[PDB]
Amino acid sequence: AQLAAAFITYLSAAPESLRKTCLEEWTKSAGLEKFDLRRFLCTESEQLIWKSEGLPSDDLSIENALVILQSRVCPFLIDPSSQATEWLKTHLKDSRLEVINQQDSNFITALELAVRFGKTLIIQEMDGVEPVLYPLLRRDLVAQGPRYVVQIGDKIIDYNEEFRLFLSTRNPNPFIPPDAASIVTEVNFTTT
Amino acid sequence: LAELDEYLQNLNHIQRKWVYLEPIFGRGALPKEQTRFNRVDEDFRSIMTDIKKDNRVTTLTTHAGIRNSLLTILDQLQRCQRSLNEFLEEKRSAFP
Amino acid sequence: DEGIDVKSMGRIFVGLVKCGAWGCFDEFNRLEESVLSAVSMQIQTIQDALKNHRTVCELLGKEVEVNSNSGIFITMNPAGKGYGGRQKLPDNLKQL
Amino acid sequence: LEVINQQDSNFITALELAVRFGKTLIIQEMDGVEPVLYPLLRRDLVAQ
Amino acid sequence: KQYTMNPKAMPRYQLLGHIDMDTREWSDGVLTNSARQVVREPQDVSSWIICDGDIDPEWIESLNSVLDDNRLLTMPSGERIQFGPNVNFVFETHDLSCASPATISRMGMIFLSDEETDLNSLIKSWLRNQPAEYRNNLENWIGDYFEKALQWVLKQNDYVVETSLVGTVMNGLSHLHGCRDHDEFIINLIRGLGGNLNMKSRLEFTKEVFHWARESPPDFHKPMDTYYDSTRGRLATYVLKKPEDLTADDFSNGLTLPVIQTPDMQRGLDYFKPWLSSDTKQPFILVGPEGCGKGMLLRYAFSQLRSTQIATVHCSAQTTSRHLLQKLSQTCMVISTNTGRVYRPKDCERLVLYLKDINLPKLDKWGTSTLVAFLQQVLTYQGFYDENLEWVGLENIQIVASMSAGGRLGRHKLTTRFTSIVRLCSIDYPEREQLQTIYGAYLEPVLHKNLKNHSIWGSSSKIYLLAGSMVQVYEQVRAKFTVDDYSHYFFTPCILTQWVLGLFRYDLEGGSSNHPLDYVLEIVAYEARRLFRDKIVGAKELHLFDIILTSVFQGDWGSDILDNMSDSFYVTWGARHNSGAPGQPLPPHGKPLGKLNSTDLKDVIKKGLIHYGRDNQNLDILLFHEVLEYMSRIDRVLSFPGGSLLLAGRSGVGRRTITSLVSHMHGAVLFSPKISRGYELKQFKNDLKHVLQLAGIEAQQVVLLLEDYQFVHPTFLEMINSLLSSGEVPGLYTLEELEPLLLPLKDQASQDGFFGPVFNYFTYRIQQNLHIVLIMDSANSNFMINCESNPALHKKCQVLWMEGWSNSSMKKIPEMLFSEVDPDFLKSFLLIHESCKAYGA
Amino acid sequence: TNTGRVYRPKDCERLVLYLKDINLPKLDKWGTSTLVAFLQQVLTYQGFYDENLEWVGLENIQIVASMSAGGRLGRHKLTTRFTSIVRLCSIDYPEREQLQTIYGAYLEPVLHKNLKNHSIWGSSSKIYLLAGSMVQVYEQVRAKFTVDDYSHYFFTPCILTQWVLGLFRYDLEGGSSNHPLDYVLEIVAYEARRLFRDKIVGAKELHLFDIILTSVFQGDWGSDILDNMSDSFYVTWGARHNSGAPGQPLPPHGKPLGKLNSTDLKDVIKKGLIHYGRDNQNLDILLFHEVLEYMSRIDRVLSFPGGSLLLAGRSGVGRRTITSLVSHMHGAVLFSPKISRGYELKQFKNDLKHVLQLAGIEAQQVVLLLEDYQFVHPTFLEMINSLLSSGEVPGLYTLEELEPLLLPLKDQASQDGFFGPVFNYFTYRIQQNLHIVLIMDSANSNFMINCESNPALHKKCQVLWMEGWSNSSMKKI
Amino acid sequence: DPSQELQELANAERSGECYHQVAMGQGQADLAIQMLKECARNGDWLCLKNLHLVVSWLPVLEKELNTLQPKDTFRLWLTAEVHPNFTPILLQSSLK
Ligand SMILES: Nc1ncnc2c1ncn2[C@@H]1O[C@H](COP(=O)(O)OP(=O)(O)O)[C@@H](O)[C@H]1O
Ligand SMILES: Nc1ncnc2c1ncn2[C@@H]1O[C@H](COP(=O)(O)OP(=O)(O)O)[C@@H](O)[C@H]1O
Ligand SMILES: Nc1ncnc2c1ncn2[C@@H]1O[C@H](COP(=O)(O)OP(=O)(O)O)[C@@H](O)[C@H]1O
């Protein structure tokens, strides 16, 4: 569990040589030089079902799709070619979903509906970290009796418990400051 | 003298601009301009009639509050200039 | 000077192509840089209208009548070691 | 259930809790129709 | 017919004219108007448009078509104004380093030199302006003493602000008129000349002047301090004047501190006294190193006056014409005489504009500030071109400005046009034997407002010895640290003043008679620790600072006095007489403090944390030693009247969480602007009007909170810089929106005793009732620029250095996530994190 | 000056205080008003004791006041001290041969701004005859009704003036050349119907009024002209050139009107009702003939510049429901003060400052709404009486709080041509841009007192008499 | 100067003057987007020029390149200069 947590909470950003070197150093640090983790954390049937949809079959793509098990924070998809995003909005068909663009006319209205109704939300063309989305990405929940409300600009909006937010990106740089990167975990689809 | 200087140095402006803007609104009368310029015409000719009565130069220091009359006539002439912008561009397109 | 509007240069060009006079645009160097870029399209349109013996050119929407005995020139220095703040002219615009 | 008196110090606070939590509310010492309780007695429900 | 422009003071679009961008409407300008006025005139005229100002090519090349073989001025609209055979342009200037040779070949030229000037031919007319009661002695003494002392100063050339010859002459002369005898005239000559030198040369200047005078004074040791009296004919005794009026009621205002009349303050006052009298209307500028005593001493000399009206304006890197214009026009009449409208001070005789900083405003890319060009226009021509096309004069205004020596960055140098018009001198740091006396005479009464009649405290050799120890600390800390390390190792005696006025806050009661050395010395060491220590970055420097502090306390008395009080937490939450929330006006030294324990503070924190999680998000806050430290340090600064913080640390650590909790526990309202899509500056102005209205009308204690993600437009730091430093936000309110808002304040203004207009009372209430919190990330790229480009942003607010938890506490965190092999897991966590710090952790 | 401080008119020579009503202020229990005693002091001694203990004179002020004859209630009599100091006379009602000429010379141009060159309209004997017919109507209605019936059978020629200036609103275009008698006479009869008829209480009086109206139209021309247009609804929602919401300044005669149908108005109502129930409570509103009538009558008065209503009816019937819907369909903001425990008058003053600021600065068309349960302090009707009658609320703002607020109005004041100070322009914008709705229950005990004790509360606003559904529609529900 | 070769190519391969071009400067961007959409619908060509001055405009350009649905025979021709701080995304999706 230490190795499986350390991989998720650190190494979804580094290139794969740093993944190999750090996993080998940690694995020799524990002393169990066998005992891989992609079979420890997922089994064969889920892998072939993920492959049945359009997930790329590399080690990098499958480990990146394993890291978005994380729900403590928001995942951040650095993704030059849109296959992984097509896969994620394929196998998130079952729950409620809306997908919106960044430079879109109805952004804040649809954002209000997605916070209220309890949707699972995917954002397409992010150029960085929006100024609006800071208390929602953090935890800012003032209570009104049994429920909780969260600040979006000027409105006061009920934070539905079924709120799940993902967002895509088309260029590895732009844009993170060192303040909106300690709360957002970053995943880089890369051709290796 | 501080009052009399400003009064004369406004009244010469008003005289020159009124002499300018009489014939244009006289010839091509558009009534939305005409009501404006008729009110300015009344407010100027009413002063000049009382000057025709008494022509002593220190009577303008002792009229019935002429200061706001002069400033308002100047301001309305500025506004009818801003209305005349479009006709100016018409005549500039006319003669090169 | 000062970086005036491209519409402000456009109306000057309209006057020059309607009258028939040589603009001797002294100090064409010191002008704001993107204004030069839009002016390049303007000058190219006028010179096309001259070379093809056109009677009716068209910039800023209207159909401005261009004159056959027209002409445009500039004068400038190269931005040398001590000629102050002057910006370098575009390559496209030099080709005109 | 909560039961409250009319001339009571915590009237509007407990009224807010009874509207939010979904209580069944009984008021004791009413001297008429309160000015406060008119849209709640009517139907005045703006949707969010 | 003369028309006089000054082309650098006003902006360009007013000078040469410009166009409204959306309306297509030609606004006129100054010299376009002047050109129309000259081409109106008939053929029998002549006119000289004069541009008495410095030269930049990007405006002076706009007149190439005027100064041509052709004679024509062109508008950008296409309107072109000719000129006849009459007009001339005359360009008074300083130099032509920055003019292109098109203009230099375009116009005529007159040269002048420093060899053609005749100094005696300007001494004689000044002597002719003398009232014929001293002129015999003055001419007899000038003609054989003046030229030697002038040429020796021009030989040394170690003078701190650059002037021309004429400037040195006038600085020599304007401290003279009214001498009686020879021995007084010597000292007036010394105070005239040697003010512009520095202390390496002023001493031998005095040596050569007294030696090539008649005799030597009895001030043979430190001859800078000779006090010639008219009463006896005394030459020199330097005497110390000790006050004996000392309570805690003097220290009630943070300003108006009791000035201890040391000999250097007497030298400063003897300098000031000839120029601020009502016969010599002189503008002058002090020079001092930063934090030395300029503003206090100049306010004392303001208070010595008769019928003046002081109006201090803090200038900075954004201060322009309109800011000083509105600071004048709030307190100045508008009376319409002949020859143009003019401004006159209301209800007084000599209004004084006190400009705080002159080095600090901003050059353009040639080297000419518009501020100093504007003040050059005023001090030369007594007027300015107000907008709406009308000259406006001034009537009775001095300008007494201040500055620091141009050592650091952000300190531009001044032009020699503005320097040699007006007067100046310099002063030095109060040295150690002086500062021991200052802070001994501060440390005796603030102590002796209690336990005055007891055993060891009293017999003020010990009170002197404590002050000498703290001076030794301050000197060795300035010896071991510099500004080349980081942006903010600030060290002035403002720190010592805030330090020794901190001691009102503590229960020093001593009725239960202690040891009692340790009970007050540990108090002293903790206050010194939380002032000096908490801004040092590196750990090895922290250990060196500990060695310094301990070596001082052991060299003063024995050993082992600081030993073990690291578990102490002097917090508001518990003191004598139950500190304990009502009482919305603040005490003059904040809420008093007292000793506590760790675990008891834990229970107080848990109680307030439960009460916070009632009406907020329920918080899963852990506890370890560092969070206790951080909350104690935030309480002991937010319980100060007018305190603010700069929280420099890593991301992710709780800072807004602890400050929100302390803001709830002290009942202060916390406010932070919630950004949206359409961020503007109008938004931010309305939110600042909200906060300023609440905190400066309703006397409520407010905490303002701005973090990194909200600075979405680059003027926000400048507005916060002003609102920290002064107390106002410049150009925020209009004139009409101050009287229906400040109208309910005249009553308390009448009852409290505060005089002047209502706006100073409003600003004073804002300075007492508003706290600012800045959370800024350490390793952002723009942190160095936004700590160097706003100097009050690390002079006003205390700067805590939050970066980095211990090695010890990161071991203890999973052990509190354990119940809520054992040590091998925990030490494995530490090693994984310490290896992963090399990528951003 | 010397001998005490004094007041003098700025920029003029003879300031004139024009006091509108003198009978109307209030006696004490002996018979002496403080107002008339104060004006007696001024017209005798040219000064007054200002407070803070100092006499203050006046310099150049006339007082030219007005009054009505002391016939009705609320009209006190004046003391003989104030009467024989100053001058007076009297004048009489313009009689019928005069009023025929007045309204003939009004009815000729407002007609002849269109169809001036056509068949029957023109040759102004007929224009005179229409005015004579309306004068005959007005005279017989004043002959058959009085003020002893109820508080509000008001009949002055202000009604005839508002009536014949109503006719700007209608598409009287006549380019498609009609009969054309019926097309304009039915327009005239409908406007007369919705002005005179809708304030008569008893049903038998309604039938008598119908006999009067029909007997006039038949005695003037033949018979059977009004016959069957009871299904008509002249509403904003549909006219010539697509009346159809932007355009926040109002037209000088309101939005123009046009002919419709019943079922088409039903669809327009259903569309706006769907759009209302989107962002509000979803409404289960039924439809029958009377609700169509009521919504037409609310639209054709709320689409007038400066209109207000007094809704006198039983409880329980929908009135706030229909007015909220029409306020949403015309895009006007609807505002009603939400009462709490600590009701005061300071609360109400702040809410009126809010509404007056919005409606008199930002040129927005506003509907204000006050009902019975909110009048929780007995000065509220008096403030609403003033704000209806004049346009101001007296003693509301101070002096310092008018210049930083009216300061952005001098520019449009300069451009529009309106002179004098800025405050008259502010009051004129409020008079053009603010609507007041009063819902009051009929059989409350205090209804008679609060219709008699505020006379402008039934002179300013049109009073619809909503009480009682039909026998026919309660069968259809 | 590439402009003459592009002009001769547009005269050779196409006829009826389908060639449309806009330079980039102060006040031309918001009509450049409109002409981009219109000549994407028409299928005619478009030649933008000087994309090294307007560096804070190119995110709008790459957004509109990603968004639009072109026709056949549409050809977008760019012209830029060597410039640091350029945007990679349109450099990915272009020939050079
Ligand atoms: N002679 C003195 N006696 C006591 N305190 C002094 C003396 N000189 C300077 N100080 C302290 O130094 C501070 C000087 O502030 P000042 O130099 O006016 O600030 P600034 O440099 O920003 O103008 C004063 O607040 C005062 O407490
Ligand atoms: N000492 C602590 N114990 C428990 N949780 C903490 C502690 N410090 C910070 N946190 C966590 O940090 C989060 C808040 O971080 P925040 O204060 O927003 O960081 P920053 O101050 O850098 O913006 C909270 O969710 C809280 O759980
Ligand atoms: N014509 C109608 N059709 C259906 N429901 C109606 C109608 N008129 C009134 N109601 C009912 O009346 C209620 C609103 O009454 P309300 O307008 O508050 O009465 P009042 O106007 O006397 O205060 C609504 O719940 C509505 O269902």
PDB file of C-alpha atoms and ligand atoms in Angstrom, chain E residues 620-623 627 650-657, ligand 2:
ATOM      1  CA  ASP E 620     -10.008  17.837  10.681  1.00  0.00           C
ATOM      2  CA  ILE E 621      -7.097  19.834  12.075  1.00  0.00           C
ATOM      3  CA  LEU E 622      -4.293  17.928  13.730  1.00  0.00           C
ATOM      4  CA  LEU E 623      -1.936  19.166  16.411  1.00  0.00           C
ATOM      5  CA  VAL E 627       0.925  24.626  14.673  1.00  0.00           C
ATOM      6  CA  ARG E 650       5.471  26.742   0.760  1.00  0.00           C
ATOM      7  CA  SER E 651       2.112  25.868  -0.700  1.00  0.00           C
ATOM      8  CA  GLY E 652      -0.147  23.311   0.897  1.00  0.00           C
ATOM      9  CA  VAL E 653       0.637  24.161   4.531  1.00  0.00           C
ATOM     10  CA  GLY E 654      -2.282  25.608   6.461  1.00  0.00           C
ATOM     11  CA  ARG E 655      -2.102  29.370   6.618  1.00  0.00           C
ATOM     12  CA  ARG E 656      -5.588  30.582   5.668  1.00  0.00           C
ATOM     13  CA  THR E 657      -6.962  27.857   7.948  1.00  0.00           C
TER      14      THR E 657
HETATM   15  N1  LIG H   2      -1.783  21.008  10.758  1.00  0.00           N
HETATM   16  C1  LIG H   2      -2.714  20.459   9.950  1.00  0.00           C
HETATM   17  N2  LIG H   2      -3.443  19.404  10.351  1.00  0.00           N
HETATM   18  C2  LIG H   2      -4.370  18.853   9.553  1.00  0.00           C
HETATM   19  N3  LIG H   2      -4.644  19.293   8.315  1.00  0.00           N
HETATM   20  C3  LIG H   2      -3.988  20.347   7.787  1.00  0.00           C
HETATM   21  C4  LIG H   2      -2.963  21.001   8.601  1.00  0.00           C
HETATM   22  N4  LIG H   2      -2.465  22.001   7.866  1.00  0.00           N
HETATM   23  C5  LIG H   2      -3.113  21.992   6.681  1.00  0.00           C
HETATM   24  N5  LIG H   2      -4.019  21.012   6.637  1.00  0.00           N
HETATM   25  C6  LIG H   2      -4.882  20.740   5.478  1.00  0.00           C
HETATM   26  O1  LIG H   2      -4.659  21.749   4.500  1.00  0.00           O
HETATM   27  C7  LIG H   2      -5.892  22.148   3.904  1.00  0.00           C
HETATM   28  C8  LIG H   2      -5.987  23.659   3.775  1.00  0.00           C
HETATM   29  O2  LIG H   2      -4.851  24.170   3.094  1.00  0.00           O
HETATM   30  P1  LIG H   2      -4.717  25.755   2.904  1.00  0.00           P
HETATM   31  O3  LIG H   2      -4.725  26.355   4.286  1.00  0.00           O
HETATM   32  O4  LIG H   2      -5.752  26.157   1.883  1.00  0.00           O
HETATM   33  O5  LIG H   2      -3.258  25.944   2.253  1.00  0.00           O
HETATM   34  P2  LIG H   2      -2.698  27.409   1.908  1.00  0.00           P
HETATM   35  O6  LIG H   2      -2.699  28.091   3.247  1.00  0.00           O
HETATM   36  O7  LIG H   2      -1.311  27.171   1.379  1.00  0.00           O
HETATM   37  O8  LIG H   2      -3.670  27.952   0.895  1.00  0.00           O
HETATM   38  C9  LIG H   2      -7.004  21.657   4.803  1.00  0.00           C
HETATM   39  O9  LIG H   2      -7.867  20.796   4.062  1.00  0.00           O
HETATM   40  C10 LIG H   2      -6.321  20.882   5.904  1.00  0.00           C
HETATM   41  O10 LIG H   2      -6.883  19.579   6.025  1.00  0.00           O
END
